[PDB]
């Protein structure tokens, strides 16, 4: 007997059994990737339960410093991996385009690990990144967890978050958190964040399809069945009566991106709330006349153009 | 229809399609693993096509130097991964037992990459390990591929190889190669090697089981269909007329291990050839009254005892 079925991607049984067929394939670490003109990546442990894929673009000068992107993948809180081709192929392309170091977090998936696990795993990964500020390479004599690529190349004055769908929901919650719990005690601040196709549930005045009213909403109950307020919990409905002030976001630049589908109306209500809040900073919008999936088809003109538009924000 | 059907593991179709039996699951990087009392691991790139899982036992002194184990997994030249549970769970247990750094190589699998690809990938990983000798942590300012854990903790006077089945075949070929092509031009030498259940084809005086005369031999044809001399190629039959001298192995200690099954008769012919060759060094044998599979069941007393026996060689 099932409590959740969205084939062929995930099946959840009443006894807690989860089946994931048809996930994208694992892609191992590589040095000097020919397809991207020399991007490299490695998979590193952050804690007993968190890890991340670290990316470096082709390095032309050993003394150069690069913007840092901390990336939280999407797909329902319940699918895919930083190490699998679907998100990995996308990330290595934005690393090449933005000439940025990236940290793609492997957070625990629902429903085996309900929210807020993914939120905390992403926060822990971000704190781990921020813990590198001011270190020199000599620190690696005694700190087994610290990353030489971050020490050598990261510019902490150009730290960015990036998320898509449920990963962009993690970005939202991470930005609220960073206003209350300052990164590395305040030693690091987030410059900017990209939220592509953010996963929010906000009541619209418009009639929605069954897909949008049921299936699209069902990921929240799957991920966080005990959420206070259900679909009106502030971590899913950022405009809820009890919701934290969006003016408290701990960054100074935002790129909110949406596509031409029924979620656009929800994202517009979010943008309206962000603007009404009085948040101080640069708010950019990339409103595409495309569908969500077109960003991730990485050998197409449309994907190249959509990704170029997002990656141009990383300065 | 199929060119190879090696049940229950792998079918190769005439049209070039490969069907594998469901593999063991991927296990991500982890810091301070509770189950092993603190082993950590990470996945690092060695080249565009080679990678490895690096393991560190719990570090109790930052100035301690450890034996280093370069490990080549088995499973037919055509299955499994350094990053999947079957071999990974085994490796983290011998890291904990031997208190050794381990490098578990992710080499290219057949038949998508026929031999000699796996042999060259394993050699390149071993050369990469050996390239760390004498480096200090300051090298990481300019060398993006070098590993701080190896620089900090590896004792190059205690370098070991370890392989099981086809991985032990890779060890054999690697040891012959290291006598002719010295590691890091002769700056590093292999101290010892473990070969558990090595995959060799040597003609016994009597025909053995249907399995040993047919399916067991088919892995070689699948992996290296154009091998000069076929099943008598020196890389699979180390006793062949044209084979390299076993006395040329580039190490000074060997542990050859086998179990109570028909492959034992072949391993005995290999041991007889090694002894007849006059190879100078310590030759240990672990001849278990157990079956092959019992080593890898890591929650059992039998597996603990078999692995303890093998790991005791790492000094």
Rounded to 5°, the CA angle A109-A115-A118 comes to 50
Q: Chain B closest CA to A149's CA: distance in Å?
A: 7
Instruction: Tell me how far apart the alpha carbons of residues A53 and B304 are, in angstroms, rounded to a whole number.
Output: 33
B106 CB near a chain A CB, below 8 Å? Answer: yes
Lookup: tokens for A260: 């031409």
Q: Do A29 and B41 touch (CB under 8 A)?
A: no
> Residue A46's closest chain B neighbor by CA?
B31
Residue A292 known to bind ligand: yes
CA A309 remoteness from chain centre: 17
Query: How determined?
Result: X-ray
Lookup: tokens for B100: 């050794």
Residue spans per domain, chain B: 1-315
Query: B301-311 and B85-98 are packed helices; what angle lies between their axes, rounded to 10 degrees?
Result: 60
Resolution rounded to one decimal, in angstroms:
1.3
Q: Residue A295: helix, strand or coil by DSSP? A: helix
Q: Do A149 and B145 touch (CB under 8 A)?
A: no
Instruction: Tell me how far apart the alpha carbons of residues A194 and A244 are, in angstroms, rounded to a whole number.
Output: 19
Residue A90 known to bind ligand: no
Q: Residue A246: helix, strand or coil by DSSP? A: helix
**Given the residues B261, B265, B284, B287, the one annotated as active site:** B261
User: Which residues does A60 contact at the CB level (< 8 Å), separation at least 6?
Assistant: none
């Amino acid at each position: 007997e099932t409590i959740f079925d969205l084939p062929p991607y995930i099946k959840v049984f009443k006894d807690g059994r989860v089946e994931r067929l048809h996930s994208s394939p694992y892609v191992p670490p590589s040095l000097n990737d020919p397809e991207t003109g020399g991007v490299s990546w490695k998979d590193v442990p952050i804690s007993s339960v968190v890890s991340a894929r670290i990316y470096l673009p082709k390095i032309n000068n050993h003394d150069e410093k690069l913007p840092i992107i901390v990336y939280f993948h999407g797909a329902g809180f319940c699918l895919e991996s930083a190490f699998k081709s679907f998100f990995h192929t996308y990330v290595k392309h934005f690393v090449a385009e933005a000439k940025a170091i990236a940290v793609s977090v492997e957070f625990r998936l629902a429903p085996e690990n309900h929210l807020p696990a993914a939120y905390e795993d992403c926060w822990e990964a971000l704190q781990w990144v921020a813990s590198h500020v001011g270190l020199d390479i000599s620190s690696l004599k005694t700190c087994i967890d610290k990353d030489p690529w971050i020490i050598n190349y990261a510019d902490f004055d150009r730290l960015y978050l990036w998320g898509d769908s449920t990963g962009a929901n993690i970005v939202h919650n991470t930005l609220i958190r960073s206003g209350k719990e300052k990164l590395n005690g305040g030693k690091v601040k987030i410059l900017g964040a990209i939220l592509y196709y953010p996963y929010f549930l906000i009541r619209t005045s418009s009639k929605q399809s069954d897909y949008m009213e049921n299936e699209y909403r069902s990921y929240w109950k799957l991920a966080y069945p005990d959420a206070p307020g259900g679909n009106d919990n502030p971590m899913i409905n950022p405009t809820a009566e009890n919701a934290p002030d969006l003016a408290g976001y701990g960054c100074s630049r935002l790129l909110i991106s949406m596509v031409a589908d029924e979620a656009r109306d929800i994202t517009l209500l979010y943008i309206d709330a962000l603007e009404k809040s009085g948040w101080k900073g640069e708010l950019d919008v990339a409103d595409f006349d495309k569908q969500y999936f077109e960003l991730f088809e990485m050998e197409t003109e449309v994907a190249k153009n959509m990704l170029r538009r997002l990656a141009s924000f990383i300065k």
